[PDB]
């Protein structure tokens, strides 16, 4: 089959944990567009963040996704 236009995939990514040890990690996180916070001034230093993400990918072909969403 090659009807990739009709193919889609939802996957619940495994729960990820990050320990913020230094301000370098905070700067790296804030440099990511996808990483958004309700309270932009939230103090992330010395804190543990848990990410529970769901990925929706629509395929263009066998290898390259036509669109990738991770929410």
């Amino acid at each position: 089959y090659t009807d990739f236009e009709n193919t889609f995939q939802k996957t619940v990514e495994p729960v990820y944990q990050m320990h913020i040890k230094t301000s370098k990690d905070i700067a790296v996180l804030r440099s990511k567009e996808w990483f958004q916070l309700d309270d932009e001034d939230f103090d992330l230093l010395n804190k543990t963040l848990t990410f529970e993400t769901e990925t929706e990918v629509t395929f263009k072909n066998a290898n390259i996704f036509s669109s990738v969403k991770c929410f």
Binding site: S23, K24, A27, V28, S31
Partner: protein
Amino acid sequence: PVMADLNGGLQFVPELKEFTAKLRKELVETSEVRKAVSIETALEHKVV
């Protein structure tokens, strides 16, 4: 006997040790932050 002070006015800054440490800390922090952000942007570009 003569004391020549060729210090360049370094004695007039208050808390010279702490201010020197602050300068080095700000420079190092900027360097590591920029390097980490550049590396992560590069990895995001490569995976995308």
